[PDB]
Amino acid sequence: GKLPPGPRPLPLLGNLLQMDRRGLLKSFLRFREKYGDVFTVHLGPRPVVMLCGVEAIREALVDKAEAFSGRGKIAMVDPFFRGYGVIFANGNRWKVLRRFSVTTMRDFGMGKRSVEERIQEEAQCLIEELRKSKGALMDPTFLFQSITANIICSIVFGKRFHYQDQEFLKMLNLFYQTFSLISSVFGQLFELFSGFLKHFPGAHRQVYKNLQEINAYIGHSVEKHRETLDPSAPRDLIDTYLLHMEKEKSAHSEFSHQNLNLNTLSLFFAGTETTSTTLRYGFLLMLKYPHVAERVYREIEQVIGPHRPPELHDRAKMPYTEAVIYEIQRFSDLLPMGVPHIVTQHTSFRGYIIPKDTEVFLILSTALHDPHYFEKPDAFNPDHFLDANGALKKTEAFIPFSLGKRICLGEGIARAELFLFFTTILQNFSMASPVAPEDIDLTPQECGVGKIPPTYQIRFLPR
Ligand code: HEM
Ligand SMILES: C[C@@H]1Nc2ccc(Cl)cc2[C@@](C#CC2CC2)(C(F)(F)F)O1
Ligand SMILES: OCCCCCC1CCCCC1
């Protein structure tokens, strides 16, 4: 009837000396073997409760939704955010920010374009730039970032940036580096001992300087918007929000500038670096499994044809591609420990008691890798999402977007980018590398808050 069991901690160090040099996750995986699906680890001074397996995670996020809906914090970025912006917002600030953030994808501008259409145009620009490389080896990183970021900017600032633009390439670089520093080994140790490390040089200081610098750009852009603002013809997200700041009198209110900047920062960042990451991994996987690429190509050829651009409508008619995409995300396993939650009350769980405000990780990646749902789960295989006839077999253990109240509000957009971008690129190209399939190493560089694929060279060969 106490906190869940786990390794016995030491005062001032916690469970430091039972961890696993590999990582926070590899550590937690070892503990799971000993203590089962629900257990307690002391990350430095605090207890944090781990939940593993799809049954436990659903039980928490869905069945006990009200209790498990709070947001914890990530030590590396907390000094920057400190509770502002939808990702790290709690209580009413979150209720407000979330509602707003959702109803501004799901509610699109009267005259302005569709979400699909924004993506469909991007994809073109992209193919019209892959051709302009005339088949050269390149690192796709900067481009995969470029296309996903332009989808947000489109909604947020009402516009896009050119792939060969400088200030733009500098920004996307601040994102990439920040995300990787958070996912770094220091970044993990920082989770454990931020209290002490705060006072010394290290990545945390860079992640701050980066966040400040992006936020500065957003800030200026907000100022520019406020000047040219038209009360009865809003251009984008920013305009919409500036018009809710119509609530200047109503007295104690959640639409601060701090929220504006921080919220936007929050979206850009999440919407840019996670899809881009998935795509990046997608194409590495295609290099290692050309048979899959070819079989996806065939379906595109057999359902869409070689000319007309793919569209969302086609998705129903083409299961193999969908299954491949699902498998990419499942295997990409982008947010292994999800993002930290907290319990909003003294909370009863499988006979244990988790006190109000205890941090709770939902080890999402124990779901995606459950052997009971995926034969040989360590291995990349589209079959995982197909029945006996090659029809799409959805499964309730596929939760890369988490569940319940906090669940990704980009799911719609992401699943649309992954489909359109993937199939459009493949429609017009085929993949080549100097490296052989047998020799392609999938092992990530960085494996922390986020799984970051190893850095690779690829070429795009017109079809
Ligand atoms: C395949 C790509 C993506 C994956 C795997 C993914 C995954 C996740 C996960 C695991 C969470 C936290 C779940 C939890 O709270 O327990 C989350 C939340 C969030 N995602 Fe995504 N995401 C993706 C793409 C996107 C996109 C396209 C956007 C659009 C802006 C986005 C914006 C957000 C935001 C703002 C949150 C915080 C939601 C909240 O706390 O209320 N993400 N996502
Ligand atoms: C789902 C979510 N979105 C997000 C948004 C902003 C910031 Cl600073 C960090 C994140 C965060 C992330 C991420 C991966 C790099 C894209 C994080 F790191 F805080 F956990 O995850
Ligand atoms: O508040 C905790 C004080 C002790 C911190 C010392 C550890 C800091 C992280 C690396 C190993 C030593």
Numbering used by the authors: 28 to 277, 279 to 491
What does the published report state?
The cytochrome P450 (CYP) enzymes found on the membrane of the endoplasmic reticulum are a superfamily of heme-containing monooxygenases involved in the biotransformation of drugs and other xenobiotics. CYP2B6 shares at least 75% amino acid sequence identity with other members of the subfamily, constitutes up to 10% of the functional CYP enzymes in human liver, and is responsible for the metabolism of 10–12% of all drugs currently available on the market. CYP2B6 is the major catalyst of efavirenz oxidation and conversion to the most abundant metabolite 8-hydroxyefavirenz, which is then glucuronidated. CYP2B6 also plays an important role in the bioactivation of many procarcinogens and environmental toxicants such as polychlorinated biphenyls, chlorpyrifos, and polybrominated diphenyl ethers.
The CYP2B6 used for expression, purification, structure determination and any other work in this study includes engineered mutations Y226H and K262R in the N-terminally truncated and modified construct with a His-tag at the C-terminus. Because of the relatively low-affinity binding of efavirenz itself, the 2-desoxo-2-methyl analog that demonstrated high-affinity binding (KS = 0.21 ± 0.06 μM) was used for the structural studies reported here. The 2-desoxo-2-methyl analog contains a methyl group in place of the carbonyl oxygen in efavirenz. Interestingly, the chlorine of the efavirenz analog 2-desoxo-2-methyl (abbreviated as I for convenience) forms a π bond with F108 in a similar fashion to that illustrated in our recent study using monoterpenes. The orientation of the methyl group towards the heme-iron corroborates the putative metabolic transformation at the oxazinone ring shown more recently by Cox and Bumpus. The trifluoro group was located near the I101 and F115 side chains, whereas the cyclopropyl group was placed between the side chains of F206 and T302. The CYP2B6-I structure adopted a closed conformation that is similar to the α-pinene complex. The phenyl ring of F297 rotates ~90° to make room for the chloro group of the analog. The F297 side chain is pushed away by more than 2 Å, in contrast to the amlodipine complex, and is likely to accommodate the chlorine group of I that is involved in the π-interactions with the F108 aromatic ring. And observed in the current structure, the R262 side chain may play a crucial role in hydrogen bonding with neighboring helices, which could impact the enzyme structure and function.
